[PDB]
Design an enzyme around this catalytic site. Structure first.
Site, PDB file in Angstrom:
ATOM      1  N   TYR A  98      31.464  29.656  35.569  1.00 36.26           N
ATOM      2  CA  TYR A  98      31.239  30.162  36.907  1.00 36.26           C
ATOM      3  C   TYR A  98      32.414  31.024  37.386  1.00 36.26           C
ATOM      4  CZ  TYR A  98      30.274  30.599  41.845  1.00 36.26           C
ATOM      5  OH  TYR A  98      30.072  31.093  43.118  1.00 36.26           O
TER       6      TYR A  98
ATOM      7  N   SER B  61      33.899  35.269  44.427  1.00 40.73           N
ATOM      8  CA  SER B  61      34.247  33.918  44.828  1.00 40.73           C
ATOM      9  C   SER B  61      35.734  33.711  44.629  1.00 40.73           C
ATOM     10  CB  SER B  61      33.457  32.899  43.998  1.00 40.73           C
ATOM     11  OG  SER B  61      33.973  31.588  44.123  1.00 40.73           O
TER      12      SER B  61
END
Lengths: 230, 229, 230, 230
Positions: A151, A138
């Site tokens: 995250y 990501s």
């Protein structure tokens, strides 16, 4: 042959990936916690390709090792692995976060990908030339922002792990790619799951001699804001 | 219309890109220092597509600026720009290097890129949705190695400039990509045609998508780690 | 001997560094384009330490080469080099910038530092163990934002060049550090004196140690994340 | 208010840090699995400062939280936290590694760090201006190499978490630094644990208005080899 293992095949971009590679007639092994949603997808895609659905939590090391050991001879060699299983949990700033959410992200986003990668590497090695691992990273693995804490850390792990894995895979032929997507739907025109599916298809069909180390894709609507001053 | 500008079209991956995009029928402006070789390629590709050979050195701001103003009207809007002109001038230890060489690399790899992108930017913005800039960076832009000094520096410039440029292009539709190749031509290194294929894929991305960066090595190439002296 | 070369000693963090190292009693070579301002600072610090002011533009390779060739014997060896000359010329969007500004920035921020480093490197090497080069990078070299374009580009050059330089300097004892300041002079921003202090600490690191990079922001400053255009 | 919590305190950068801060007279909470080595160290340093040895595995969440809630009122505010507990478990190619070791490194280097930082974060915020968190990352978090695999991923996690944390701590005064050491003693003249201790002391004693985001430090004998071609 052209065999593909997809984790979290009803999560995020997993379904779109399953559909895209089914269109191309790859044999599919689809991993999912939700037995009913997974099994319906497998049944649908079963009309255009061979599909093996495995109801399975990637966090569960023992179950994952059992599932892999019990794979049919069709999968003695594995062409592709997409490590897609992963999630973001919570909103709170780090200091008011729930450690349960943090454990789940680490176990899923990191340990899940480590289990699926390690357990399946021998089969990827055995395929050799043209084999491909695509890890779902990501933009959060590179760029800090409020609430990203674990995250983003999780995705930064995935990024470095991919690069490091390539240093151990000499003479093997196995490729490793960190795909780093930005803003998804999955008037801003965000990335669609089918965009990720097409991009992974392209990555995995690269000429045997080429390794895309990393590829960061954002919607064109998305850029960087710079710094905040309190 | 599908119009493409390529710096160093005789130099690096420039010819492969020229050939690849001619196959797709894009109208091409090709620049290069070597006039005879540039013209022979244009003459050859003129059978498949429209080509305009421009003899120029990207380091020359005035010549680049004159050439851009003099482009024909089919280029009032521009679909793609491949900033491919660039060089390395050896891997000697920094402390023994020739500052002329360092000058050539800064002026070519950074200034040449800056001139081409700024002068052409309004035309790319005029095209709008679907427009793409591909900058040719390198693995040298993030991974240090002996003798990398200035080449690697210039490629990290290119990387950061690319990302920065996106922050200025809101609402224009224009896309910016930093392509970072490793070892090129028993290693099976990257072929120029692989870079040409890669750029075509980047430039043909659906309008809504921006590929920020793409690092590509031959599979034979990985990281050695650290040296201890 | 503790000898230090400082580019742009009347620009940015340059004067603060001259003052700090002056109180420690290092001999200074100070460059500046503005002769009067440079000689006043030189005159003043002359009471504390030996100072050689050189009036030159770092972009001027020929001037720079002649000045270094004309350094007094005191500087046959160089303990320290601070590459501090550099500037920004706006946050106007790239498509509408003046190429004069962009030219000025790469000539100064890049070539200036290149000429500096290359011409002085044999003197730093002659010093050997304990020698230090500190380059002024920036948070801009790493984190993208609106209007950063060329300045951030130049600072990214500086970062990579720093790391790269280390790979050529084996067996020499010479250290290289990229210092990356954020917001400088509510917000309580970085003060020039804070940078002087941090460069002092860097240059006085035990000889076996190399600080590759050090990124410093005021605590009021963090990252805003992404911007989405609708 | 001058208190410090150190994880993995018995022998590492850990012991060196405890000893360095004891000279400065900070009140010490020392965390460690090795009870007797831990207690002997606390007993020695009790001559110089207040020490509290706590026997614990940072992987054990319930024990960490019980230990934290059981801290004296002296630590109602906390000035510094050094997240130092971490391990590498070898340099074998990923495809032949034992998942036990990978569990152990993820549980210690990531989860352990996350527990100590979440549980103590409200005490660091209570202290406020001048409070510091120093995470121990590594050159491995940024630079790939054979056998780095999980360890490097783990340290890339730490770096990104560090930067992300800063985005959640705006207005609190709490500082977060990622420190990234290279070759350590555990003729190359490598980083000594006392060097790490010295640099963390400098970091934690920084003026309140300043945050050192990261500091990568190598022995000068260490640089980058570049690429391998098989």
């Amino acid at each position: 042959s052209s065999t593909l293992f997809i984790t979290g095949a009803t999560s995020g971009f997993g379904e779109a990936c399953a559909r895209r590679f089914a269109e191309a007639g790859w044999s599919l092994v689809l991993t999912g916690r939700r037995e009913e949603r997974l099994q319906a997808l497998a049944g649908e895609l079963s009309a255009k390709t061979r599909v093996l659905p495995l109801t399975l939590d990637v966090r569960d090391r023992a179950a994952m090792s059992a599932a892999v050991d019990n794979l049919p001879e069709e999968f003695a060699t594995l062409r592709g692995l997409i490590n897609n299983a992963g999630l973001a949990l919570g909103t709170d700033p780090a200091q008011s976060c729930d450690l349960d959410d943090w454990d789940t992200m680490v176990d899923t986003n990191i340990k899940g990908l480590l289990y699926s990668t390690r357990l399946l590497l021998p089969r990827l090695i055995a395929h050799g030339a043209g084999a491909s691992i695509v890890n779902l990273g990501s933009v959060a693995g590179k760029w800090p922002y409020p609430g990203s804490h674990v995250y983003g850390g999780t995705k930064a792990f995935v990024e470095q792990f991919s690069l490091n894995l390539r240093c151990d895979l000499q003479g093997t032929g196995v490729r490793v790619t960190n795909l780093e997507p930005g803003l998804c739907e999955s008037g801003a025109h965000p990335i669609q799951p089918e965009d990720i599916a097409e991009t992974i298809f392209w990555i995995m069909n690269q000429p045997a001699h080429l390794n895309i180390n990393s590829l960061e894709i954002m919607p064109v609507s998305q850029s960087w804001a710079g710094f905040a001053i309190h």
